[PDB]
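Bug report (template v2)

What were you trying to do?
Predict the complex of my protein with nicotinamide-adenine-dinucleotide.

What happened?
Run completed; filing so the output is reviewed.

Input:
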Amino acid sequence: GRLDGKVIILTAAAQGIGQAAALAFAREGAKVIATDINESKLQELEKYPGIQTRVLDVTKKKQIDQFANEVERLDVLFNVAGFVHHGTVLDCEEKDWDFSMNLNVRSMYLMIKAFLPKMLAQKSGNIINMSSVASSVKGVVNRCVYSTTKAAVIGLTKSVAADFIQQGIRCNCVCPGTVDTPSLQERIQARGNPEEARNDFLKRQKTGRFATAEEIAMLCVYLASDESAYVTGNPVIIDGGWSLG
Amino acid sequence: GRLDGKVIILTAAAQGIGQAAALAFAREGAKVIATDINESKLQELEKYPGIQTRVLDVTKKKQIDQFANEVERLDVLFNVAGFVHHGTVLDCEEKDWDFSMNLNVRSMYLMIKAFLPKMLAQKSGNIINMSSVASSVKGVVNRCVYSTTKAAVIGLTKSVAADFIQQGIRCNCVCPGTVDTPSLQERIQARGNPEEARNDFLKRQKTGRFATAEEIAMLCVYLASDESAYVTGNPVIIDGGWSL
Amino acid sequence: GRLDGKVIILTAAAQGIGQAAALAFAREGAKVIATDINESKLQELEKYPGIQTRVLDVTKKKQIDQFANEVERLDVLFNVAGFVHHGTVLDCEEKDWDFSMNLNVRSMYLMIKAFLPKMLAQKSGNIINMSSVASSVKGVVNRCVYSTTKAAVIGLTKSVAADFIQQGIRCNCVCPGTVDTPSLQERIQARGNPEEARNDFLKRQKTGRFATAEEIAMLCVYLASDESAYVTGNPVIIDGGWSL
Amino acid sequence: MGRLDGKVIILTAAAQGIGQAAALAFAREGAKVIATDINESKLQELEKYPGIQTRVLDVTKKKQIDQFANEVERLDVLFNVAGFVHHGTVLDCEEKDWDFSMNLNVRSMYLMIKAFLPKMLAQKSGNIINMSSVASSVKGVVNRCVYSTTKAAVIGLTKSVAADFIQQGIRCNCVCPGTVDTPSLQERIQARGNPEEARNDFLKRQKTGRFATAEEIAMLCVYLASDESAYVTGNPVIIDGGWSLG
Ligand SMILES: NC(=O)c1ccc[n+]([C@@H]2O[C@H](COP(=O)([O-])OP(=O)(O)OC[C@H]3O[C@@H](n4cnc5c(N)ncnc54)[C@H](O)[C@@H]3O)[C@@H](O)[C@H]2O)c1
Ligand SMILES: NC(=O)c1ccc[n+]([C@@H]2O[C@H](COP(=O)([O-])OP(=O)(O)OC[C@H]3O[C@@H](n4cnc5c(N)ncnc54)[C@H](O)[C@@H]3O)[C@@H](O)[C@H]2O)c1
Ligand SMILES: NC(=O)c1ccc[n+]([C@@H]2O[C@H](COP(=O)([O-])OP(=O)(O)OC[C@H]3O[C@@H](n4cnc5c(N)ncnc54)[C@H](O)[C@@H]3O)[C@@H](O)[C@H]2O)c1
Ligand SMILES: NC(=O)c1ccc[n+]([C@@H]2O[C@H](COP(=O)([O-])OP(=O)(O)OC[C@H]3O[C@@H](n4cnc5c(N)ncnc54)[C@H](O)[C@@H]3O)[C@@H](O)[C@H]2O)c1
């Protein structure tokens, strides 16, 4: 397996990209600690060899620190947790702004701050953060606070990469286009005409399809593996040509 | 003047880049409304033709909304306010993280959401945001929360530019290298050996100097003027070759 | 004027962006040496205070070297010459590939290598190169060799900027979206349905217009001026939200 | 089952360095590899490896290229590897240096793509990987004028092909390394006045205190060549050990 010997911790693992990653990591021989707030859905992964699960709300610092004190070592941290708000800056009220900033960015700060010292004591570690093309990468309509947080993810990634490169740490982030996940389906259904919302989303995608969560996972495998040891400080795009032009 | 007939509001105007921008706008014929929390320093600008002042804390939504209700129209909003925390992710306590996120990003969100509707009703407007090369542009050491916020600023910029391009709104951000401002001097002094600190900052700068606030201001003039009408959604770098 | 005391040499000056640049530089007090292969059109600029003209084919090293020897000093070199080939990689025959590489890229290399030593001896110089968003910035349809060359331009820009920063040289390039020039009109007319071709080009442009050459010129004035001394190594976008 | 099972892959400059490592890596992942180079005796060493067939090919010769293409029934992937690294500023670069690099580093790719793309279009499926560098439009690097210009041009060419042929099932990406320990890198070190010291300037780029191996570059090429990366197109993928980071 491409990840033999690796201990990997991830968040938001119960469905979507996190689930697919958890499964993909485990199949490649990793020791996976898969976390989510949704305990009943999460515990489904316990049936898969190589995966152990734990309930974790990434907005709760007390929860995070206690979890960190339980973990002996890790090789990889994959911060997946994030919410996609629909709206422009005018559509974003204070509670939407804060909710996204807390879940999407503060979460990563708290996870990295709890887990990075373990990596530093072993002079080795790898941190993968979930960003988006809707970010500093490009402008995307109706995604104000999302794009703002997802840009923030890139800043945080490059910061960590620069600060700890000489202590054996790498840090990268993943920037997908549209991925067929349960939340995407929720966002389609939430529209006034879902039949039509599905077509706006496909418009971005000149190949005529969304990415699968598995495809996103296989990039995370590459970035988790020693194959990519020489890759750090990058937003890796996986967008089906959306940001291309 | 290159900014004649323009009504420009800007924050953090009492010193540094804000101050230089205020004075540069005014010299180019703008009607400037220059805001800061520091009332005594801010009110020095009152002596300059074209500048009117108002005390404003950009972290206070209530103050922001009241200010907006006072303003009949604008052409340009320049979000300048921001703090530079020194440290890695490990040096950043929750208080540091939240203070920076509130002043550096939330501020912009609240200012934009208050003033943008004005611009939309006139089908015209221009929002300039202060970012930095310490951001999504490149990795800079001991600047964790700062870089995170300044990246957020680029995301917010591109978002606003994308959402309101068809309603005559432009949005760009400015990404300096090291600029000789009073806060920069504070950061130098704050280190263990301020001699040595000054040389680390210069190491960034292969031209052997920092930028002046007036130089940053002249970029802001270009971006504020109709000369740059066709420029939107960009992080404009002004870094003396640092990110090169 | 904003360019008072600057000696500025430019290519492809007889029409389009070059022409607008020349007139804009002259209006701001520059001493302009405007060059082009089209002698009769070029000579029109002679009537404008501050512009002297010289015929120059930028694909002819021997002409370039002899021109350089005529020139005592410069402050700015503006490489404007470039041709826009229509087609994919499959539409591009060896003749199209080579013609574009030589005019669009080799030209810049020859002008730079002939004029840069002057700037090095003054310990001061500024090189502006015309790029495009159709380049390494973004992928654009039916622009294969063009995009290849305009990418090459960014490479060359950043090279020169990195190599000569400590000797007082700056180098940047300009990356437009669609600009309403005579060659753009020629490209429109050259299509099967020019009525419909005008609309494809417009679809690029969410503000519903092309840039004017004057607008591109004003970016060039900013980049040519000492106002922008701290700006080097950048591809400056001016695209009306196309790459956004 | 290898990650490249069923894939027919053609590459250039396969006899040493990145190209060699890639050929070997593609073959071990179950690709059918057609490995080409100008250096016949060295290239022929790869014939002992299961899955690799070799052919002499000078990528500056249009006539050679078209005849080779006429020999190939199908391909899934084209990896354009050939490129020379000139040492010097714009001032150090004479007409012959400029032209030599432009023809090998860029014209070569144009000709290979123009010969092979029609095959991929006819199958409504193809993947083109181009070798670029961080010394390019990505960042400014000293003493690399014509190299950086060509490797920028590669990125422009990559995005053009990706934009033009996306709807016909074609992907195009490029790879942008920092310093890779290859034989030509060793040549460039040895060619300096003090090779001990050239070696340390190259290491200065590299905050991790090492160069990449050709193998490491290869494994990125495996990912980009595989269907795992089917949703990746139009990108310069950086693999630079933090060099462009800051
Ligand atoms: N799906 C896409 O089109 C797409 C595109 C780009 C980026 N992303 C990013 O990928 C990541 C995952 O999204 P997805 O769509 O694959 O999954 P999703 O949105 O379908 O699932 C989210 C998961 O996160 C969990 N979660 C919610 N709040 C949490 C909290 N406080 N703590 C811990 N877990 C929590 C949920 O229980 C759920 O299992 C997000 O960061 C998202 O921004 C998604
Ligand atoms: N090297 C540099 O100085 C540099 C480089 C890149 C970007 N920047 C950015 O430029 C912007 C201005 O920084 P500067 O160093 O020119 O000025 P500075 O930091 O010296 O001045 C900051 C000003 O902001 C005001 N201020 C502080 N909190 C406020 C609040 N809550 N509400 C309203 N005003 C408040 C202060 O009273 C002061 O007048 C910042 O966003 C900074 O991040 C500076
Ligand atoms: N027009 C646009 O939409 C647009 C967009 C992006 C970039 N550009 C770039 O701007 C530059 C100028 O294009 P434009 O469209 O403004 O002008 P244009 O194409 O209308 O005019 C070109 C000028 O170049 C001159 N010229 C041609 N060959 C020459 C040679 N060998 N030596 C010297 N001069 C020569 C011509 O005589 C003419 O006066 C080009 O590099 C072009 O790629 C144009
Ligand atoms: N530090 C690095 O080594 C580094 C970094 C970034 C990018 N690259 C790129 O990787 C590619 C390979 O370089 P490398 O250093 O791994 O290998 P190399 O330079 O050691 O070997 C080059 C190979 O190309 C072959 N070759 C030369 N001319 C040819 C021609 N006309 N036709 C066909 N083959 C020809 C040679 O015989 C040799 O086998 C180049 O494009 C280079 O620019 C290398």
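What did the reviewer find?
Residues C 11-12, 14-18, 36-38, 56-59, 80-82, 84, 103, 130, 132, 176, 178-179, 181-184, 213 surround nicotinamide-adenine-dinucleotide (ligand 3) (CB under 6 Å). Strands of chain A lie at 7-10, 31-36, 51-55, 76-79, 125-130, 169-176, 179-180, 211-212, 235-238.
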